[PDB]
C-alpha cells in the first residue's frame, strides 16, 4: 500500500542544468508523476528528496521499521556509500534502486553501485518513467 | 508497434532447473504473457530465444533493417560477446536490456555487461515482470 | 580521565534489525554498559552517536581541542571517508577503532579502513565488549 | 564581479592541529586575506566554509543559478564525493579547484579529484597564496 | 578455563632489537604478564611461542581437539601462510588474532591477515595489553 | 630575482597546431608576456625551451649549482621521465610544475606526474596565466 | 549406468596438428577407447564432440534432464563461456572437467575456468587418460 | 596460389549501418575489389564470411589441412575466442589478421586480440585496403 | 615401480575437523587405501606426511635422486610456496599434484598454485580417489 | 606525392644484431628499397632514421607544417613517448605505424602503442613489405 | 672480522639437477671457494644452509646478537617469507643479498624480494662469484 | 680485457646534490677509481657518462660491434627506456646493471628495470664499489 521513493544529492536540482541528458522534467513536476501514477496502481506514494545522507538514511531507518517498499535514487552517494547501503541492508520490503541516466553509458565510476547487491532489481536509463516501472513492479507484487 | 523479444543462451531452461531463482514460469509462458501484455499496450511482441550467438546476430541484423526496438537477455553472453554488442550498436530504435535475476548480487563477472554502454537503459533483478515493464517503457515512447 | 566514544552512521539502530549478527543490545543499553565500566576504571564516557559526517567531525574537533582520547566506530564511513581521517589525524591522545562485526569476514571493501592507519589500535569482531576492552587501554595507559 | 570561495571538511580548522604544514594562518585571516585580494582586484568574495556535504552542494546550487565563478577546497571530499562533482558540472562558470599541501607528495588516495576533470584548472601546494592566484585568474578572464 | 597464547616467529625476540616500537617488554616478562592476568581472571595461560610454522601447527591442532580457545600472534606467517589458517579454521573455541603493533600503518603487505576473516576478533597496535584484553574477552565469554 | 622558466617537448609548437584548446599565443610571445610580468614583479626571467631531454637536464643542474627557482612545463616528459626528476629532486628554491592544458581532463596517462611529488606546488588548466601566476607566488616568497 | 563425454572446439583435430604435446590419438580413437574403458567398467558411454556451442549447450540439457553424470573438456570455450558454466550449473549428476594439455604450464589466459567453480572436480595434464580416470571416478561413485 | 579471406560476426553488414567509420562498401562489394586484385596478383581469393564461430572454425581446419595462408578479420570473436586462436595456431601458412577500423582508437577491450600473438603480422585502420595490402605481401611470399 | 605419495600441511588431520567436506576416512586410512591399490597395480607406494615444509623438501629431494615419481598435495604450501616448486623442477619422473577438494570452488587464494605450472598434470575435487587415479596414471605410463 | 618515412631509436642496427629477427636487410638497403618502390608509386620518399627523440620530433613538426603524411617506426619510444604522440597529434595528413616484427608476439610492454590510439592505421609483423604497402595505401589515398 | 654466509631452501642442491644454470659447483665446493676468499681479504667466513626457515631465522638471530654482517641467500622464502625479512630487519651490520641466477629473466614471482627493502645492497645473476663479490665489500667496508 | 662503463642521465651530479646518499664521491673521482681498479686487474676500462640517450644508444651500439662488455649504470632510463633495452639486447659480451643506491629501498617505480632481464647480471646498493665488483666479475670470466 504505501511506498517511499527516496532521492538523494542533486536530484532536487532535476529539470535544470542539463535538458538534453535527464530531462526537462522538475522534481515537482516528478513528484506529482508519481503521486498521480502510484494512486492509479491504487498505491500511497511518499516521495522525499534530500542532498543529506543523514537525513537519506533516516527516511531508510523509518521504513525499516514500517516494513515499506523503497524505491531509491541515491544520486552520487549511489557510488561512494556503505553507510547507506547499511541502512537498506534492514529493509523487509522490497527495494528497488532507479537511474534516470544510463550510468553504464557514462564514466566507469559510476558502473559500480553499492546499492545494487542488496536490492531487489535495478531499473537505469529510462528516465523518469523507471520510477513509474517501480511503481508497478511494486503493484504487482502484494 | 512492433517490439522484438529476443532471449539467448539457457533462457529456454527457464522453469526447470532453479524454482527458487528465476521462477517456476517457462519460456512458453513467459512467451505467452510477453503477448499478452502486449497487445493490451497496443504492441506486437515477436518473442524467439536461441542458444546460437549466430540466430541471436541475425535476429539484431533484421531488427536493425526494420528499425523495430528490441528488449534483449542475451543469457551468458551478456559478459561475454563483443560480437553482440557490434550487431546491437546498429540499433536505431531503443534497445533494454533484461535479466531476469539481479546479476549485482551473484558473481563478480555478472556484474560487467558488454550490452549496458549501448543500451537505452537496463533492468535486473525485477523477474519476468522486467519483460513487461520494457513493453510499458516501450509503449509510451512512441 | 575523560572518554569520548564515538559512534557514526547506523550505530543507532543497534539492537534492531540483526539480532544473530550484533547482537540485541541496543545503543542505549551500549550507553550504559559503557559508562558504568568507565566509572569502575575511574573514567568519564562521554558517548555520543550520529548519523551525520558534520556532526562526527565537529565531535572529533572537539577531542582534538580538548586532547581528550578517542574510542570511534565510524560505521560505513571507516571504508570512505578521508574528511573523518584528516580530522581524527589532529588528535594529540589516543585513537581507538571500534567495529562489533570482524569487518575481515565480510565484503572485500569493509576490509579497509581510511582510519586504521592513524589509530594508536583497532579492536574488531569482538562485539561490544570491543568499547569496554577499548575502555580499558585507556585506563592503563594514563 | 562576484566569486565564490568555497571551503569543505576540516578547513575550518587550519591555523591549528598543524602548524609546519599548512601555515599557521587561520580560516578568519584567510577570510580576511581573501576578501582584501578580492576588493584590489575589483572584485567581491564570498567566503564559506563547512563541514557538512549538504551544505557544500547548497552553495553550489546556488553559484549555478547565479552563474558566478567558484574557487572550491573541498577537503577530503575532493578524494570521495560523486555527489559533490555532480554539482559542479552544472557550473557555467569557471571552477577552480585549490588545495594547500601538495596532495601529489602525500598519500596515493589523495592523488586522485573527483572535481580536477570537470574543473578549469587546479592550483596545489602553493599554500594559502593558491587562493588569490585563483582570484586573480578570475579576475584576468573577465 | 584452558587459554592457549601462541605467539609465532620473531616473537622470542621481543623485548630486543627495538625498543621504541614493540615495548622493552621481553617474551619472559610477557608469558609472567599473561599468567597472572589469566590467574586473576580465574583462568589458566599455556603460553607458547616458535619459530617453526610445524610447532605452531602442532600447538593448534592439540587445542582443536582440546576445543581450547587461541590467542595467536603468528608473527610474518600472519601475511603468508595458508597452512596455519587451514588449522585455525579447525578451532571450535575461539579465536582472538593479536599484534602488538599497528599493522595498518606500516608497510601495505602487513595489513592482509589470512587469520582475520577466520578469526573472532583482531586486537591490533595496543601493544602487549592486547594480550591481556583478549584474555578478558575469553574471561567474559564463558 | 632570477627565475628559471623552462619549456619542454612540443612547447615550442604553441600558438599552432590547436587553437581551440591552448590558446593562439605562441610560444615567443609566451616568453615575451613572462619577461614583463617578471619585471613587473622586481623578477628576472630566464624562459627556454627544448625538445631534448638532455638539454633540459642542463637547464635544471645549473639551476641547482645556482640555487635559483624554476617553473617546469615538461611537456610530455611529465608522465614518463624519472632523468628529469632525479635532475629537479637536487633543487634547493622552489620547483613550480605548469601545465597550459586541464591534463586531468585528458587521457588517463596524463593524470600522473613523476614531477608532482617533488615540486613545491602544480598549477594546471589556467592556460597561460599559470606561468604568470607561478611568478607571482616566486614574487610573494622571496 | 550412462555418461556422456563431451568435447567442444577443436578437438575433432586431436591427433593432428601438435603429435608431441597432446598425442598422435585422434578422436575417433579417443572414443574407442573411451567406450571399451566404460564397457570394463560397466557403463555405457555416449560421446560427442562440437565446435558450435549451442550444440555443447544443447547436449548439457539433455544430460540434466537425464540426471545423468557429464565428462566435459569444453576446449576454448572453458576460458570464454559463461553460458556454458550456466547450462552445466544445472546438471545434479556429477561434472567432471577434463583437459588434456596442463593448462597451468601455459598461457596464463588458460589458467582460468568458468567451469572448475562448478565441476565436482578437474583433471588437466594427464593426456588422454584423464578421461579414463574421469570414467573410473564415476564408476567408483554410484 | 590459394588464399583464404574469412570475415567473422557482423562482416556481412559492413555498407550499412555507419557510412563515416567502415566505408559504404558492402561486403559483397569487397569480395569483388579482393577478388579481382587476387587475380591481378596472380593468387585466388577465397573469401567466405560468417556469424558462426563453428563455421569460422571449420574453414580455419580446411585452411590448415590444405597448408594455404588465411587473411582473417574475426569480428567481434577477435577480442574473446580462444577456441578461434586454437584453430588458428594449426596453420602452417601465413595467417594476416586485418581489422576494417582503428582497433586502438577506439574502447579499451577491443586493443587485445588474441589473435595477433599467433599471426604473422596485422594490419589496422587502413580500411578496405588493408585485405589488398595482406594479399600483396602473400603474393611478395611466395 | 616405486611411487612416493607426499602429504603436506594439515593432511594428517584428515578424517577429522570437517566430515562434510573431505571425508571422514583419516590418513591411517589413506595410507592404507594407496598401498592396496599401489600393490594392486604392481608398485609400491612410500606415503609419507609432514606439516614441515624442510621435511617435504627432503623427501622430495630423495625422490629427484631416485629418479622416482610423486604425487604431491602439499597443503597450504600449495599456494605459498616457492621452496618446494623449486624442490620439485629437479624431479624427473612425474609429479603429480593432487588436491582432495575442489580448491577452485573455494577462496581465489586457493585458485592458484606453484606446482601446478611444474607438475605433470593436476587432479582436484575428487576427493581420496584422486590418489588412486594418480596412482594408475603412472602405473599406464611405464 | 611527398612521403615522410621516420625510423626511430636503433632502426639504424636493422641486418645486424639479429638475422632470423628482422631480416638481413640494412637499414641503407631499406632506404633504397622504399625509395624505388616509392617512384613506382609516383610519390617521393624522403627517409630518415635517428636515436634522438628530439631529431624525430623536428621531423614530425616539418611534416605537420608541410601537410605531409609519415610513415612511423618509432623503435623503443613507440612503447614509452607521450613526447612523440603530442608531436605526431598534429599531422593533418595519414599517420602510418609500421613494425618490423610482430610486436603482439614479443613481451606484454610491446603490446601498447602510445601512437596507434592517433595514427590511421598500423602494420606488424610483415617485415620490411610493411613499410611498402604503407606507401601503397598512401598512393590509393589522394 | 666475521662473516655469516646463510643459504636458505634448495641451496644445498647446487650442482646436481641443472649444470646449465647454477654452476656444478657443489655445496661443499662453494663453502671451500667462500672460506677460502674470506682468509685470503683477513675474514672469517661461517657458511651455513638449511631447508628450514626456523633454522635461517636462528642463525639470522645470532648474527643480529653478535652485530655479525650477514651474506644471505635466503632461495625461495625470498620471494614468500615476512618472517625472515623482520629478524633481517634487526641486524646492525649489513645485510647483502645474494642470488646465483637472474631473478629478472626468469618468472615474474621472482622479481620481488621481501629482503632487497631491508638489504644493505643485492648481487644477482653473476653466479657464485655473487658471495666473493659480497665478501669484498664487507672487507672494504671495515 | 676492454671493458666499457657507461653512466646515463644524472650521474656526472654524482658527489654533489645528497652527500648522504650516493657518497661525496664526485663522477671524475669514479673515473679514476675505476681505471686504477681496472689496470690492476689487468684489463682496461673505458667510461663515459651522457644526459642523452641517444648518446648511451651509440655507445651500446659501438660496444656491441666490438663485441666488448658493458658496466651500466643507466639513471632513470633503467625504469623508463625500452629503446636502451633494445640496445643492450645486441650485445654479445656481458653486461652488469649497476646501481650505486638500493633501488628496492626507494620509491616502487625504481624496482622495476627494463635492463635486468636481459642483463648477465646486477649490483645494487653497494655505493661506487659496485663498478669495481662488476670488473672484478669481469675479469674472473675471461
Ligand atoms: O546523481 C546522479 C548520479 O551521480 C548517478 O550516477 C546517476 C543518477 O542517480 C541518475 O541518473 O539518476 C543521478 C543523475 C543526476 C545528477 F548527477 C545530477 F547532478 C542531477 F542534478 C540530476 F537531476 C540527476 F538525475
Ligand atoms: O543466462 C543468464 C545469466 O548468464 C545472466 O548472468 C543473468 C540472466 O540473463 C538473467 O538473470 O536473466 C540469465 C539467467 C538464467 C540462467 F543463467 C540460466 F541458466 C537459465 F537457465 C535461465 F533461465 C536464466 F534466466
Ligand atoms: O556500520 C558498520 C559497518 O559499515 C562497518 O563495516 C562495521 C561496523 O562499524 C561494526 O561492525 O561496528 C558497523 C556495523 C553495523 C552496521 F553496518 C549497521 F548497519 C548497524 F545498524 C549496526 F548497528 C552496526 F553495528
Ligand atoms: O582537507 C584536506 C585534504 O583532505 C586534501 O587532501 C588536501 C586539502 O584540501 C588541502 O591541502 O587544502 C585539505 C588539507 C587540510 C586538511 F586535511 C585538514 F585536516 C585541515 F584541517 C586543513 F586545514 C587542511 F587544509
Ligand atoms: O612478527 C610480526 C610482524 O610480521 C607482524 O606484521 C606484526 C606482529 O605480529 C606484531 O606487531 O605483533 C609482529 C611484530 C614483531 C616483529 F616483526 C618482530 F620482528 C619481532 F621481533 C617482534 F617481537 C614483533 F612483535
Ligand atoms: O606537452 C604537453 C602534454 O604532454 C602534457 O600532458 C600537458 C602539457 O604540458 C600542457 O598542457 O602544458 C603540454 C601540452 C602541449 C602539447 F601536448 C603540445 F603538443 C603542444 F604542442 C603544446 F604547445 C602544449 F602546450
Ligand atoms: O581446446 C583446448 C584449449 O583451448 C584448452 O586450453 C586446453 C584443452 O581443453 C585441453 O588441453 O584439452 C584443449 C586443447 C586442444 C586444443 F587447443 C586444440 F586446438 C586441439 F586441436 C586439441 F585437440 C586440443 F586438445
Ligand atoms: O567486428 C568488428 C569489431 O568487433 C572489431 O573490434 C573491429 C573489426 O574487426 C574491424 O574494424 O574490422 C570489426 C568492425 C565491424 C563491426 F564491429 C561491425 F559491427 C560491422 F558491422 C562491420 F562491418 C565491421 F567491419
Ligand atoms: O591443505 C589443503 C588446502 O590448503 C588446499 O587449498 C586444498 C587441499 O590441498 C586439498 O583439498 O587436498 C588441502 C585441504 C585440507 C585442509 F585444508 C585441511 F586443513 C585438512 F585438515 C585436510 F585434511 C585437507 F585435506
Ligand atoms: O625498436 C623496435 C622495438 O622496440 C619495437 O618494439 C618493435 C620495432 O619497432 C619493430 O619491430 O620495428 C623495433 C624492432 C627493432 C629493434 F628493437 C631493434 F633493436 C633493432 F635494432 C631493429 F632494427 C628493430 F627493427
Ligand atoms: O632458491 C632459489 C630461487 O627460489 C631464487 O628465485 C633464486 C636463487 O636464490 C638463486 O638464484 O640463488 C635460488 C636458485 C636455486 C634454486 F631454485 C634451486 F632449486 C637450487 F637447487 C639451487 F641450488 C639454487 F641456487
Ligand atoms: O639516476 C639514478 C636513479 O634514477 C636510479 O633509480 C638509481 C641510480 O641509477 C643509482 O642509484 O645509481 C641513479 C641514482 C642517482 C640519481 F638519481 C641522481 F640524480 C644522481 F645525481 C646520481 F649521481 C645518482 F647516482
Same mark, same amino acid.
Request: net charge negative.
Given at each position: ?33 508519481? @503521486? ?29 521499521? =514500517?516494513? @515499506? ?15 547507506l547501503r547499511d =541502512?537498506?541492508? @534492514?529493509?523487509? =520490503? ?20 553499492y ?28
Amino acid at each position: 500500500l504505501i511506498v517511499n521513493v527516496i532521492n538523494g544529492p542533486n536530484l532536487g536540482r532535476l529539470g535544470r542544468r542539463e535538458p538534453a541528458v535527464y530531462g526537462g522534467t522538475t522534481h515537482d513536476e516528478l513528484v506529482a508523476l508519481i @503521486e498521480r501514477e502510484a494512486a492509479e496502481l491504487g498505491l500511497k506514494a511518499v516521495v522525499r528528496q534530500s542532498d543529506s545522507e543523514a537525513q537519506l538514511l533516516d527516511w531508510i531507518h523509518q521504513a525499516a521499521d =514500517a516494513a @515499506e517498499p523503497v524505491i531509491l535514487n541515491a544520486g552520487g552517494l549511489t557510488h561512494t556509500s556503505v553507510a547507506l547501503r547499511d =541502512a537498506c541492508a @534492514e529493509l523487509s =520490503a522490497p527495494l528497488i534502486e532507479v537511474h534516470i541516466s544510463n550510468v553504464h553509458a557514462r564514466e566507469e565510476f559510476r558502473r559500480h553501485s553499492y546499492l545494487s547487491p542488496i536490492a531487489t532489481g535495478v531499473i537505469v536509463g529510462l528516465g523518469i518513467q523507471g520510477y513509474l516501472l517501480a511503481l508497478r513492479y511494486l503493484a504487482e507484487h502484494v
